Amino acid sequence: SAAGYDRHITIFSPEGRLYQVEYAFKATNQTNINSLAVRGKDCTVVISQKKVPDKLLDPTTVSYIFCISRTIGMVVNGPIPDARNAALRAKAEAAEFRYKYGYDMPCDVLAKRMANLSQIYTQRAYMRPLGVILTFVSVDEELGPSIYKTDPAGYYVGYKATATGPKQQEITTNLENHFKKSKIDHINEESWEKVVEFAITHMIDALGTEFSKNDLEVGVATKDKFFTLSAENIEERLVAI
Amino acid sequence: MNIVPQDTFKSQVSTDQDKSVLSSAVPSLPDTLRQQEGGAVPLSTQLNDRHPLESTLKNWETTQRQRQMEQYRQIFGIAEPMKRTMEMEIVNRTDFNPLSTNGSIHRDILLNKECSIDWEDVYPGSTMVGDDVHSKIEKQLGI
Amino acid sequence: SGYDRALSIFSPDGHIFQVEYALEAVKRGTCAVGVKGKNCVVLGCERRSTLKLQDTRITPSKVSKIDSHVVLSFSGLNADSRILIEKARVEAQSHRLTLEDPVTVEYLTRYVAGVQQRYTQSGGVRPFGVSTLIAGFDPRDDEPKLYQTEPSGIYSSWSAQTIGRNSKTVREFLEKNYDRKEPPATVEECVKLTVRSLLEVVQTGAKNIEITVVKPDSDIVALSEEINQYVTQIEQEKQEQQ
Amino acid sequence: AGLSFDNYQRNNFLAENSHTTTIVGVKFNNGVVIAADTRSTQGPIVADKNCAKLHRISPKIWCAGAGTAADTEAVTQLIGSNIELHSLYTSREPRVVSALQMLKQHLFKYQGHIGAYLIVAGVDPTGSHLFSIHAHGSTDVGYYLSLGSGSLAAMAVLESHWKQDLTKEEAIKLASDAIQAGIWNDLGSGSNVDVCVMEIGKDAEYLRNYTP
Amino acid sequence: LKKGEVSLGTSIMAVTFKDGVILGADSRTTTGAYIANRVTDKLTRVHDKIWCCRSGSAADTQAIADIVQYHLELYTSQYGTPSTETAASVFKELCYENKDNLTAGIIVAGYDDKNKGEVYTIPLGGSVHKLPYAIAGSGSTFIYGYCDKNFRENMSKEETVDFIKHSLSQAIKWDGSSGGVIRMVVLTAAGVERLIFYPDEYEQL
Amino acid sequence: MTDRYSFSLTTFSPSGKLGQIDYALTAVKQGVTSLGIKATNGVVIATEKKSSSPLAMSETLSKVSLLTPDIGAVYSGMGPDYRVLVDKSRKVAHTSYKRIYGEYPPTKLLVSEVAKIMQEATQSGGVRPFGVSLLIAGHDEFNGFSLYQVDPSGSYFPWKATAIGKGSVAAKTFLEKRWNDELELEDAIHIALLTLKESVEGEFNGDTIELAIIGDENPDLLGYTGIPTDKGPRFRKLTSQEINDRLEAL
Amino acid sequence: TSIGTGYDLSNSVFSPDGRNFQVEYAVKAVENGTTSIGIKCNDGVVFAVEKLITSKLLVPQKNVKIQVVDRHIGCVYSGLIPDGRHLVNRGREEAASFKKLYKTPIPIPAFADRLGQYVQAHTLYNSVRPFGVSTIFGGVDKNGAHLYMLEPSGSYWGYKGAATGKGRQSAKAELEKLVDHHPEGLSAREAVKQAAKIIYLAHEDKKDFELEISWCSLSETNGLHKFVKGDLLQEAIDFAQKEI
Amino acid sequence: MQAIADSFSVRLVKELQYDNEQNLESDFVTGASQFQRLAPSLTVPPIASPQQFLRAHTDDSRNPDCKIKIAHGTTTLAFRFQGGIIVAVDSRAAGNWVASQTVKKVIEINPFLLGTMAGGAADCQFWETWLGSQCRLHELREKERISVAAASKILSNLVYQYKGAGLSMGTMICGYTRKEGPTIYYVDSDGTRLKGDIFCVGSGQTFAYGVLDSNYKWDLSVEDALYLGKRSILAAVNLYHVTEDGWIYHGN
Amino acid sequence: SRRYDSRTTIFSPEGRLYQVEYALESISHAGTAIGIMASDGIVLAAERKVTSTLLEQDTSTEKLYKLNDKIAVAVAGLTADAEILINTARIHAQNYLKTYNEDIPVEILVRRLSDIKQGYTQHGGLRPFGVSFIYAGYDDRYGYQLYTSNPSGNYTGWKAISVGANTSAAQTLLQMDYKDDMKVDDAIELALKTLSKTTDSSALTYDRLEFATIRKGANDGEVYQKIFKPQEIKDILVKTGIT
């Protein structure tokens, strides 16, 4: 635990650690929701586990996947208030980039911008980090399918395929085993439906459970647009496999 | 929703319009020695014969930011402009370096000018009175 | 105590402890004496023992000439005194420019007290740990003026006042030797009284006493060796008394 | 901060008291060519007989200007610095559209008081681009553009011999001929010809004194 | 206008028909008497099915169009596809709040599911008028009577195309600031269609 | 009132030491080792590219960044602080020197600017000191090659060879036993690879090593041809294949 | 673990477990407020408030617990009265701004998002405290009927049935029973009767009480928020009494 | 933060221009602070050339009663001697301005100082009333009578801060103090402060000055000085005698 | 006491400022610098803190700095704060030269820097500058001048002084071996002997010293500064036998 003035602000501990950032990382995994992101030949798929423990809650109003712009989609792990705050900030940043530089914002630049904001939060004493982990997925015109992730510490990096949540280790190990088996670093399917089916099967195998149409939230990013699949589409994908 | 700065003129003038350089003997008159402006610059001369572009340049970025805040308020709500202004005020208030005038890195990051250069940055900008640390401390803390 | 960690906190008994701590810091520095004569003012100061490898050519004078008719001495912190002296000189020149009339002693003392008060109105500043003695003559008559200003911003008018370390002994000597009914008519008597008062606490009066004399018409003469002559004469008279 | 307005009233007081080029751009099937003359005149007098009027914003984005020479040079240098910083920040090849946006916004900020009329050519991963920029902040897109005092003769030559599908050699020859016509028929144009050719996927080729 | 500033001496015509809207213009940019550009794209896209044409100062109109496009991107990030009325309102607010320093006039043609295609005109000064059709520019003055005599409501696509072609051909013929090709954008429910007509086509009408 | 000021976050201990700066140094010493060794015709900068769960692309995140075409830098400590400092250093290099004298700044002046920024960070009541240490290698016409180390306090020192991070003492001893006045660029690269081989706990291949050189001019990286006076970049980044080929060989 | 010492004296501090204790204390303050419920029928939303009978000196005319934001928006809250009143005022300002801009009534999801952003913005700095109110609001727009509940943390969700206050838990159970009794749908009058029944079941604390029921339906109030009239209110009270 | 939120929430008030604090204060919307500013605030047009606008809209004679009043300034002469200061003005005017008392052409700044009126009458009246208030405040603060030089310098600085704005006033501050003696200063709207012994301002200033210089002596009598002043006035009649105790009116 | 040391704007019950005292005590962890004023020149000699041979001793800019052509400074303490203050002093000297067309006197610059340092000790948001300066200069008013300034903001004038880790022993050595009629060579020898006797490492090698001398004469009567290169330091050590 912390000891001294390094309990409310972000300053160095005697061991050279920032405790508030670590506690924000702890806060990120308090939603008990796992997400997966995999890039195909010409598409990107994000699948988030959906839990509705209360039947008095409208399922259609529960969503952690946001449409930042035409081509960029975002998935947030953590509490929904900071998720929505980050979504609004990302929308504003993408629109301002498009206005100022004359072309659409790529995923990596947006991830770097959010990481710089996170660094501001981690260095300023009177500002606190957002306890959320952000994953931007798109199909950049210069780099193809792209998945990038940023954390409360201000660190961002791109992934061939990524998993997040309390049970992210098993999914990551299964993904590494699949990549070693295939050694192409991506998914060979040429249709986004097949990539969604593969992601569903991988999630089912990793978590050891079977989902319904209301237990998943799927977003697909193509070259032209990013769209979130509805309940009927997920049900069709489940019936197919 | 302005593009060119507007209402840049002053509606009224006074001898004590600048409270920071008020004379201690007569608080209703400016102190010419501490102004260090040459001693022959009445305020009236600042109302006539000005370049028609100085006001536009000195209020350009502020006008653009105000238009952006207005658009956010119209589209997103009050929370977004409130948060932007709160962050900017917090960054500005906690920085006090009397020996430099360069802006902080965090301010440039918030203003989305990390990799942008204008003539203000290239050209940021002796006296016997009022150029020490104590004057800046008094100005900062309202003493 | 719990009521001494800020300048904006009142104690239950009705005291501000930070002001008292600033006064204690003032009472740590060298002594400073101001004596008012019939038509002259004398400022005496104590200099710590000069080290062998210290340059005595440009050693600072404890008495600073704010204006051609107003002088200032201090006790406490030297750098804060420099800041206050700079501000006082700037204000004197500004007032002369604005009103064509040189500052009066009371006006300058009030300005110094106001600056010291303003530096107590915020929690982000440290008040000056300096107590000042301002001496002079108003530039329209021959009335001596001596004022004492404290870190809290309080200024008072005195006839003979001592501030600094071991000021109680000098104050008692002045009380037992100075009478307001018959102030020293001549400059020599006032200088001798100041030197004798300073000798009560100074180990060596040959090299630790500084005397400055202010007279009407804005003259201000600082005594050089002459202080040694006064010390020797006082010692001779004391031994004659013995 | 920024450009100063000091001594403006003094300059007006002194003034009241009596105290005082051919550029072409041709877009061909796989790139863009920009050519210019090489004579600098201080009025009637020829100050320099070989001057480089082709300035570089980015390794593959070049421009040539007219109007106020100091303003043109300063604006080009500032936009080049901004483009380099943007490319370093994004780790991507700069785009001509970004330079166009920066130039347009900077010129519109000063409301036409910065006199610089530019032809900007470039090649980026999205393709080849050629733009004309006015001093007030208005930009136009074209396949062949001309600028300067000899722009009418150059435009006549370009209109005479322009086609949709042009090779690199044909485009270079057309630009050289336009600059030559401007040199011969206009008093303000003379000397040699400077050319810069930019293809897709290849380094920019800068030829000074292409035709002497 | 300011000294030495480019002026948009164009010919603009927006017509509403049974299935949507069509916005057409010429392609000439002049410098008094010298044609600076024979081919220009005067049809500015503000949103996927919201287009406009500009008149007055070129720089001011371009800045206003960029700001409006940015505003509509921000709006779309929140509430989806906007309406022609919203874009017209943003244009009108920008033009009216800045009429003391900027000279700008806009013609906005849009389509949406609710309103099924609309035309708005914002002349110099900053007032917005909703009309079944609108004409603007230097040449528009020569086809007022012709357009008045030959306009019908709920025309077919080809009838509207022919009407715009004939009217713009006459405007080009009688005006020295109107150019060669005619560019038209058709906004309907199916999508966005682009048409171009050459002088050898419409000069023989 | 109590809102127009903030108390200083960095204060002196009774022993005469600044606690925040010492804690920043401690945080730096816990980071991945980064080293730099200067030769007679070049400077070599090397670092280990530690990775998260093996699904990330190591090429996307680069720990060695070009500051100017002749000056590069590497860090040990916190990534976002290094990224922010790199952006600010590039902007300062362009504003202060390129837009004034028409030339890129020399290595010492850019290092001094970075040190000034870090010192201003340590003197503020609103921000904590930076938690990185920077090794900056550059070349200039009037001073040849140079290598500098910048600490979180804003103190910069010249170095013939140095290393920071976890394995710094052992690396310093090895470089002291290896460095000589007649060393060349290839020998420096070999020594840097040998020093890194003793500090990497995992796979010592080209995918986990980032290496850059301040050598000679590179006309092929300039981007255009035609100006003999203009020269190519003097800062180059070694690819994975080149690093692997050097690893297989001596 | 309900009392985190050392990490609960400031608004924007993360605990070692990664929790904000000021927000949870605000939730605890909400749990001590009056019970308020909201139900969503086929084409409308019904709000019910159980109020305590205060002194007879109060005017029974101008004192209304249920707050009105806009003609199609109804809102109730449980917690601290000043915070809820301020939140209602902010919602009214937001709805007025949206209608003034886009010439249409503000859609319910947009209103909920704006309120959630405003509430969440108060958990970012140590100079402000989170609102101590949970707000159940709803209305009717072009897409139909919407009902939302917003927590002190700034999190909001859409609910088939929402309950807050002291007697929330049992009320929630009753609400669940409602979903287990009318899965296909529910009418507005049945919604009013069931709201009265649930309020009567969940008010067993004792001190006499009163019931306030309001509704907003397309087929009953032309898509407007109106209080239940005396006849239907008395019918609902009689039905609730008979059910017990 | 709450004030920030309020500042970003919303037309009718904006058009009324009541969103500005200065407009609210000038119309007494929220209080009487407009009458609480020791240094008065003067309104100027919000245009690029306020000075030429004011000059064009002032040099337009259309209504005789809508014009700015100008002080008489026929002939005013002031001199000093061992007995104090003698000031002499003309009681010359009718013009539809019938009044109970004669027009006062000398401003009574305080019981010890006198201010001659010339040029614009309103400027002289307003600014000398302001000067009297400043002198009274200074006397209260310093517990001493303010010197004439200090007041003249205050007025000179005040009129210099608005140089070229449109003020047209020229005054002669006359006083007697124990510190200095008898003092006369002249301050005009240009910014000139001039200490003098004999002053003559007006249309017939030349003849009066010649008469004064013909028979001027430092050592004279009060009757002789008054007769000399009256004769100099009549060469081209209110009289004031200023001594250490104050000013006494000797009009005839 | 920890009750009154957290802030820089709190007086202790005894009337002491703990932060200033801690900043003054921080000087003892830095190298030794010595300034000796001779009858015809000024000698500045500082001892480095080099712990490894890999440090570049050729770039001998660690303790001795130039403010203008006539004033030089010896630094003891944090290098970054010293660099900030040195840049400020250089800018101030250039401003004075531009304003008056005369070189700034040493005392004015020393007083300006001392005022800045004192101001940094009076604001709660600014910590004191943990540096000490030895100023050596020449001007037409007082000839040769040597000054010392500490973090508290106090400056004093001396004939021969030292600041650093061994102030007491070096001061005693200077007191025992100082004459008012010494020349520049005698001052150089005295500084070298004082550094040699008061050292932590016996081997007083060339690569651990920084030397500077300000001398009159030059062309015909000018005053010039000479910052000794390592070769010159080695030669002087060989001449004195210290090596």
**Taken in order C115, C116, C120, C126, is the CA torsion positive or negative?**
positive
Residue B78, CA distances (Å) to B84, B137, H244 in order: 10, 34, 68
Question: Of D205, D195, D210, D201, whose CA–CA distance to D34 is shortest?
Answer: D195
CATH number of the structural domain spanning residue E135: 3.60.20.10
Domain ranges of chain C: 2-240
Residue G16 near residue G166 (C-beta atoms within 8 A): no
**Taken in order E133, E139, E141, E143, is the CA torsion positive or negative?**
negative
**Could you tell me how far CA H187 lies from the centroid of its own chain?**
9
CATH number of the structural domain spanning residue I131: 3.60.20.10
Residue D112, CA distances (Å) to B52, D78, D105, E57, I69 in order: 12, 17, 11, 12, 47
Question: Of H245, H29, H14, H19, whose CA–CA distance to H145 is shortest?
Answer: H245
Residue C39 to residue C186: CA distance in whole angstroms: 8
Question: Of D28, D23, D24, D61, whose CA–CA distance to D169 is shortest?
Answer: D28
Residue F147 to residue F170: CA distance in whole angstroms: 20
Residue F89 to residue F148: CA distance in whole angstroms: 15
Q: Compute φ and ψ for G178, nearest 5 degrees.
A: -60, -45
Residue C40 to residue D24: CA distance in whole angstroms: 90
DSSP letter for A105, please.
Answer: P
Residues in chain E within 8 Å Cβ distance of A92? 74
Query: Which CATH fold would you assign to the domain C2-240?
Result: Glutamine Phosphoribosylpyrophosphate, subunit 1, domain 1 (3.60.20)
Tell whether G244 is within 8 A of chain B (Cβ). no
Q: Compute φ and ψ for E192, nearest 5 degrees.
A: -110, 125
Domain ranges of chain A: 4-241
Interface test with B, best of F85, F88, F97, F128 (most B CBs within 10 A): F88
Coil vs helix vs strand at H174: strand
Q: Quote the domain boundaries for residue E141.
A: 7-205
Chains E and C touch (3+ CB pairs under 8 A): no
Q: Judging by DSSP bridges, how do beta strands H42-43 and H75-81 pair with one another?
A: unpaired
Radius of gyration of chain D (CA): 18
Total tally of structural domains belonging to chain E:
1
Length of chain G equals 244
User: Which residue of E lies nearest to A96 if distances are taken between CA atoms?
Assistant: E70
Residue H99 to residue D31: CA distance in whole angstroms: 93
Residue D96 to residue D126: CA distance in whole angstroms: 9
How many C-beta atoms lie closer than 10 Å to residue I136's C-beta? 26
E strand residue ranges, chain F: 34-38, 43-48, 65-68, 71-77, 132-140, 144-150, 156-158, 161-164, 209-214, 224-225, 235-237
List the single residue in C100, C104, C107 with the smallest CB-CB distance to H153: C100
CB–CB contact D3 B4 (8 Å):
no
Q: Would you state the structure tokens that stand for residue A191, as one six-digit string?
A: 């249709």
Residues whose CB is less than 8 angstroms from the CB of residue D155 and which lie 6 or more positions away in sequence, other chains included = D146, D178
DSSP letter for E132, please.
Answer: S
Coil vs helix vs strand at D43: coil
Residue E161 near residue E22 (C-beta atoms within 8 A): yes
Q: Is residue E1 part of a domain?
A: no
Q: Compute φ and ψ for H59, nearest 5 degrees.
A: -85, 55
Residue H24 to residue H42: CA distance in whole angstroms: 15
User: What domains are there in chain H, each with its CATH number?
Assistant: 74-252 (3.60.20.10)
Helix (H) or strand (E) holding I160: strand I160-163
Coil vs helix vs strand at I189: helix
Residue A16 near residue F27 (C-beta atoms within 8 A): yes
**Taken in order A78, A82, A84, A86, is the CA torsion positive or negative?**
negative
Buried b (16+ CB within 10 A) or exposed e, E105-119: bbbbbbbbeeeebbb
Angle of helix F185-197 versus helix F240-248 axis, rounded to 10? 80
Residues in chain D within 8 Å Cβ distance of F91? 85
Angle of helix E84-97 versus helix E58-79 axis, rounded to 10? 140
How many C-beta atoms lie closer than 10 Å to residue I137's C-beta? 27
Coil vs helix vs strand at B41: coil
| Tally of helices (H runs) and strands (E runs) in chain I | 6, 10
DSSP letter for I3, please.
Answer: G
Residue I157 near residue C59 (C-beta atoms within 8 A): yes
DSSP letter for H66, please.
Answer: G
User: Which residue of A lies nearest to F21 if distances are taken between CA atoms?
Assistant: A12
Tell me which chains share at least 3 CB pairs under 8 Å with chain E.
A, B, D, G
- From the candidates G34, G35, G135, G164, give the one annotated as an active-site residue: G34
Angle of helix G230-243 versus helix G188-202 axis, rounded to 10? 50
List the single residue in B100, B105, B121 with the smallest CB-CB distance to F84: B105
Helix (H) or strand (E) holding I94: helix I79-100
The three-state DSSP-derived secondary structure of chain C is CCCCCCCCCCCCCCCCHHHHHHHHHHCCCCCEEEEECCCCEEEEEECCCCCCCECCCCCCCCEEEEECCEEEEEEECHHHHHHHHHHHHHHHHHHHHHHCCCCCHHHHHHHHHHHHHHCCCCCCECCCCEEEEEEEECCCCCCEEEEEECCCCCEEECCEEEECCCHHHHHHHHHHHCCCCCCCCCHHHHHHHHHHHHHCCCCCCCCCEEEEEECCCCCCEECCCHHHHHHHHHHHHHHHHC
Residue H224 to residue H211: CA distance in whole angstroms: 13
Domain ranges of chain F: 1-249
Residue I6 to residue C241: CA distance in whole angstroms: 56
Tell whether D97 is within 8 A of chain E (Cβ). no
Q: What angle do CA I165, I169, I170 make, to 5 degrees?
A: 80
Tell me which chains share at least 3 CB pairs under 8 Å with chain H.
B, C, G
E strand residue ranges, chain A: 35-39, 44-49, 65-67, 73-77, 133-140, 144-150, 156-159, 161-164, 216-221, 226-228
The angstrom resolution of this structure is 2.7
Residue D65 to residue D115: CA distance in whole angstroms: 10
Residue I72 near residue I64 (C-beta atoms within 8 A): yes
Residue A167 to residue A163: CA distance in whole angstroms: 9
Q: Judging by DSSP bridges, how do beta strands I33-37 and I41-47 pair with one another?
A: antiparallel
Question: Of A45, A130, A20, whose CA–CA distance to A80 is shortest?
Answer: A130
The three-state DSSP-derived secondary structure of G141-181 is ECCEEEEEEECCCCCEEEECEEEECCCHHHHHHHHHHHHHH
Length of chain A equals 241
User: DSSP per residue over F210-235, as a string?
Assistant: EEEEE-S--GGGSSEES-SSS---SE
Residue I82 to residue I61: CA distance in whole angstroms: 12
Q: Would you state the structure tokens that stand for residue C225, as one six-digit string?
A: 């060796």
Tell whether E62 is within 8 A of chain B (Cβ). no
Residue A33 near residue G134 (C-beta atoms within 8 A): no
Sheet of I222-227: strands edge to edge? I160-163, I33-37, I41-47, I209-217, I222-227
Q: Is residue E2 part of a domain?
A: no
Residue F121 to residue F119: CA distance in whole angstroms: 5
Tokens 């009480």 correspond to what residue?
G209
Residue A56 near residue A37 (C-beta atoms within 8 A): no
Helix (H) or strand (E) holding H130: helix H121-142
Angle of helix G108-120 versus helix B79-93 axis, rounded to 10? 20
> Which amino acid is present at I53?
T
Residue A36, CA distances (Å) to A79, A195, A224, C208 in order: 17, 12, 22, 83
Experimental method: cryo-EM
Q: Compute φ and ψ for I137, nearest 5 degrees.
A: -155, 175
Question: Of G236, E204, I111, H189, whose CA–CA distance to C85 is shortest?
Answer: I111
Q: H52 burial class (0-12, 13-18, 19+ CB within 10 angstroms)? A: exposed
How many C-beta atoms lie closer than 10 Å to residue B90's C-beta? 21
Residue F74 near residue F113 (C-beta atoms within 8 A): no
Q: Compute φ and ψ for E154, nearest 5 degrees.
A: 55, 45
Residues whose CB is less than 8 angstroms from the CB of residue H7 and which lie 6 or more positions away in sequence, other chains included = none
CA end-to-end span of chain I: 46
The CATH code that applies to domain A4-241 is: 3.60.20.10
Q: Quote the domain boundaries for residue I56.
A: 1-243
Residue C96 near residue C75 (C-beta atoms within 8 A): no
Residue I47 near residue I192 (C-beta atoms within 8 A): no
> Which amino acid is present at A81?
P
List the single residue in H37, H41, H162 with the smallest CB-CB distance to B44: H162
Residues in chain A within 8 Å Cβ distance of F80? 115-116, 118-119, 122, 153-155
DSSP letter for A106, please.
Answer: P
Residue C130 to residue C127: CA distance in whole angstroms: 9
For domain F1-249, the CATH superfamily is Aminohydrolase, N-terminal nucleophile (Ntn) domain (3.60.20.10)
Interface test with E, best of B59, B71, B80 (most E CBs within 10 A): B71
Our CA-based measurement puts residue B37 at a distance from the nearest CA of chain G, in whole angstroms, of 41
List the single residue in A92, A96, A124 with the smallest CB-CB distance to B106: A124
Establish whether H121 is an annotated binding residue: yes
Our CA-based measurement puts residue D104 at a distance from the nearest CA of chain B, in whole angstroms, of 14
C182: left (phi over 0), alpha (psi -120 to 50) or beta: beta
Q: Compute φ and ψ for D196, nearest 5 degrees.
A: -140, 125
Question: Of C153, C187, C147, whose CA–CA distance to C39 is shortest?
Answer: C187
Q: Would you state the structure tokens that stand for residue I142, as one six-digit string?
A: 């007082």
Coil vs helix vs strand at E99: coil
Residue C174 to residue H231: CA distance in whole angstroms: 65
Q: Is residue E131 part of a domain?
A: yes
Residue G113 to residue G158: CA distance in whole angstroms: 11
Residue D23 near residue D119 (C-beta atoms within 8 A): yes
Coil vs helix vs strand at G223: coil
- From the candidates H74, H75, H116, H171, give the one annotated as an active-site residue: H74
Q: Would you state the structure tokens that stand for residue F70, as one six-digit string?
A: 């002749």
